[PDB]
């Protein structure tokens, strides 16, 4: 069945364990379930009892200071849904100050409907970063998981659950040592799924028996009717507690059994719009026989007789007691401490109020942004007033920004006195506009509302500055805006110029934020322009920025600076924000020229794009050149030693700012005394241009030479070709072939003094430069005796000689050894000399 168990009302558990016996046979619990304060309790007697059939909890589940529980998995195995009709200080599940709780063990949490969860002060928990609240919850912002054993990574956390990437890591999400968290496939989120991933009928949640069935899942969404659940219940029945529908034979006797005023925990339930509501709202009055409520004759305000005159609103729990009420017969204090925001639920909770009798006081709030959650305020009575005879009291609101939109709003105050202090994001224009809708105009106290600290850290001005002349360069920028004076021109301190960069024009409004480092706006200060006493003046002020990167987007605006005084005047001015850009210029040098010698007619060369683009570059400038190979080597005898082989600040100094305003106004009061005494009333290289690439090969070029190849990157070309500097790299081919050695007729000439002159031919297209003919002569039985002849020796002789030879038959052979290496040998010739 869907809900086969019984209904159980709310209950509390205190000082013993014997009162948990009466949870024997039910599944749903209306109200709440509090387990509280057992101290004389061993950890042994929790390993034998359970509550397997409890599925649905309406409002909240509370555990606080129980001595002896280590996990709840032996108590609550099958609960799935927290309905959250009533809450508990914005929460619905609170675990606080546990002493033995090793692991949570709550492997069946499916959907937290309304509220949040928070667990504090438990030095024994673990696996808390393996829970993934965003799959169960519908909000993550008002959760609070701090100050536990998992403040330090020490509790193990080895656990076998799809290992989601919902954060920046691939963390695996499991409940306990033996369970994994179940996660549905994301095509069907809140409908509930099976183990095979085929999700159920749309009116179910969590576990199911068989999918696509509205009669055999575990827990539906809207209501319940007799093993089925329909979106809206048919009217043989009326809805009740927004989770069931039931016949009017049921609701009638709860009005009857406790119309006898024996307990104030009832309310006289009234049929209206198929709902079994405790009190039907204003504009209606109940009939006796029919048990409905008809529209009343005339206006009937559903008053809300507030106990002890004032009820502080701390959270949505404190605010839900005022739901439906419209006449506040006391006073009202809102007090929301810390947190994120509550302005999404106050509108649907007390947004139907019209009449407050006492005073409205807003103290110590931190996270309100506007008072617009009060939808229908028009009249504040003030039969009683706060001390000092006040009726509206705002104090210490760190982010209260807009009181109301006055164009669609009304407000009357019969009597009383208003008050404001320490509202750093609340403008002085609004409180004066607050006076102009109010019944009061000049009912003040002296000292009345503040004038110096209200909105001192959030700017407003009702004067604007237009720029006049902007000057654009690639490095500097000159700025000049309109002249301006306050109603007394001695009160002027200069101007403040804030500026920073931006990649786009999605620049936020400058709220006011400083840092002693660099994550926000930087600011320069400007001396005020001199006085001309002439309405056609030189006094257009200006300032020139220096250290700007070329081709960069910028955003600037200027601000005035007046001495704050007692007069509610000379508010200064704000220039509008604009956008300017620096000009383009020369590019920077390209990076990493990398060439590889693989072939003779393929010389590859790659590079990197430059660091500073200075705008969109267009192409590249390559150049190459051949060279005669260093003719100092032509006069070396290559037979001696040595042969060569080629291949912290000041954001604010506020005391001095206080000194700067002091001595400047000291000059104001000095001439102020002078006037009141002296005046008395009367009674070329081969090249190309390459585009859209990062590597280049050059073909049709000589074997074994160096090519110094340099490369520039460059912007637009045909008007004012302007490019960067280059960087030079030598380039070489593959090592040479057979042409380093020569074939030729090895002929000899015998002279009569036993000196033999050899004639041959040299290499014609050598390995760049042939450096040595390694000639070698060999007698029979004698080793290959080598001899030497240099470049200049062959050049003068056109051949070589050998002196002092024994008579016989010799074998002479030549090797052409170049500077890039040795060649092969020639033919060993047979010449013979005789006795």
């Amino acid at each position: 069945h869907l809900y086969p168990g019984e209904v159980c009302p709310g209950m509390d558990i205190r000082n013993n364990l014997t009162r948990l016996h009466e949870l024997e046979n039910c599944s749903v619990i209306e109200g709440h379930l509090q387990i509280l304060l057992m101290f004389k309790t061993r950890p042994e007697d929790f390993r034998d009892l359970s509550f397997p059939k409890l599925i649905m909890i309406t409002d909240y589940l509370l555990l606080f200071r129980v001595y002896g529980l280590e996990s709840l998995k032996d108590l609550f195995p099958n609960l799935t849904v927290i309905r959250g009709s009533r809450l508990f200080f914005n929460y619905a599940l609170v675990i606080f100050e546990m002493v033995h709780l090793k692991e949570l063990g709550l492997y069946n949490l499916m959907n937290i409907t309304r509220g949040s969860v928070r667990i504090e002060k438990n030095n024994e928990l673990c696996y808390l970063a393996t829970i993934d609240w965003s799959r169960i919850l519908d909000s993550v912002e008002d959760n609070h998981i701090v100050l536990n054993k998992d403040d330090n990574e020490e509790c193990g956390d080895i656990c076998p659950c799809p290992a989601t990437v919902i954060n920046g890591q691939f963390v695996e999400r499991c409940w306990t040592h033996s369970h994994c968290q179940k996660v549905c496939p994301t095509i069907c989120k809140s409908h509930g799924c099976t183990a095979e991933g085929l999700c159920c009928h749309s009116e179910c949640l969590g576990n199911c028996s068989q999918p696509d069935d509205p009669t055999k899942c575990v827990a539906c969404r809207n209501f319940y009717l007799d093993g089925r659940c329909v979106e809206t219940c048919p009217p043989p029945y009326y809805h009740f507690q927004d989770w069931r529908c039931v016949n009017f034979s049921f609701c009638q006797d709860l009005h009857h059994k406790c119309k006898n005023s024996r307990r104030q925990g009832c309310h006289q339930y009234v049929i209206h719009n198929n709902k079994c509501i405790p009190e039907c709202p204003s504009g209606y009055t109940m009939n006796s026989s029919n048990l409905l409520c008809t529209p009343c004759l005339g206006p009937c305000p559903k008053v809300c007789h507030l106990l002890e005159g004032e009820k502080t609103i701390d959270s949505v729990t404190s605010a839900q007691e005022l739901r439906g009420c419209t006449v506040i017969n006391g006073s009202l204090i809102i007090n929301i401490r810390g947190g994120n925001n509550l302005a999404a639920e106050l509108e649907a909770n007390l947004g139907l109020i019209e009449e407050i009798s006492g005073y409205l006081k807003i103290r110590r709030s931190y996270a309100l942004v506007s008072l617009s959650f009060f939808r229908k305020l028009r009249l504040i009575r003030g039969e009683t007033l706060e001390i000092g005879n006040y009726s509206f009291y705002a104090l210490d609101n760190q982010n209260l920004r807009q009181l109301w939109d006055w164009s669609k709003h009304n407000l009357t105050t019969t009597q009383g006195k208003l008050f404001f202090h320490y509202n750093p994001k609340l403008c002085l224009s609004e409180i004066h506009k607050m006076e102009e809708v109010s019944g009061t105009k000049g009912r003040q106290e002296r000292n009345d509302i503040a004038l110096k600290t209200n909105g001192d850290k959030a700017s407003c001005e009702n004067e604007l500055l237009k720029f006049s002349y902007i000057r654009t360069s690639f490095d500097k920028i000159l700025l000049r805006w309109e002249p301006y004076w306050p109603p007394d021109f001695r009160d002027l301190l200069g101007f403040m110029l804030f500026y920073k960069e931006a990649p786009y024009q999605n620049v936020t409004e400058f709220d006011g934020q400083d840092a002693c480092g660099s994550n926000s706006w930087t600011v320069v200060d400007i001396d005020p322009p001199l006085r001309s006493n002439d309405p056609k003046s030189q006094n257009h002020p200006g300032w020139l920025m220096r250290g700007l990167k070329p081709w960069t987007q910028y955003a600037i605006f200027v601000k005035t600076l007046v001495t704050f005084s007692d007069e509610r005047r000379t508010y200064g001015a704000k220039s509008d924000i604009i956008y300017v850009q620096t000009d383009a210029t020369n590019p920077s040098v390209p990076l990493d020229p990398i060439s590889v010698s693989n072939s003779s007619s393929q010389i590859i060369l790659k590079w990197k794009p430059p660091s500073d683009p200075n705008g969109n570059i267009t192409h590249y400038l390559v150049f190459w050149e051949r060279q005669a190979e260093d003719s100092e080597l032509f006069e070396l005898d290559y037979c001696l030693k040595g042969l060569k082989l080629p291949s912290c600040s000041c954001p604010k100094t506020d005391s001095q700012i206080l000194k700067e305003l002091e001595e400047s106004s000291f000059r104001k009061t000095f001439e102020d005394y002078l006037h009141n005494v002296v005046f008395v009333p009367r009674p070329h290289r081969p090249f190309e241009k390459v585009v859209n690439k990062e590597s280049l090969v050059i073909s049709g070029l000589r074997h074994f030479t160096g090519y110094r190849i340099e490369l520039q990157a460059c912007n637009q070309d045909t008007p004012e070709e302007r490019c960067s500097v280059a960087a030079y790299v030598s380039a070489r081919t593959m090592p040479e072939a057979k042409a380093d050695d020569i074939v030729g007729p090895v002929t000899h000439e015998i002279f009569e003094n036993n000196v033999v002159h050899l004639m041959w031919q040299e290499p014609k297209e050598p390995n760049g430069l042939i450096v040595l003919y390694e000639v070698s002569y060999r007698r029979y039985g004698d080793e290959e005796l080598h001899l030497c002849v240099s470049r200049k020796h062959f050049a003068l002789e056109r051949g070589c000689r050998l002196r002092g030879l024994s008579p016989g038959n010799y074998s002479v052979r030549i090797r052409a050894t170049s500077l890039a290496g040795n060649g092969s040998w020639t033919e060993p010739t047979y010449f013979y000399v005789t006795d």
Partner: peptide
Amino acid sequence: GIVEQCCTSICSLYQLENYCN
């Protein structure tokens, strides 16, 4: 006395002509 009569509020030509005899 010429400041608070002619710097705090608006000032008239009949007022300050008394200052010049």
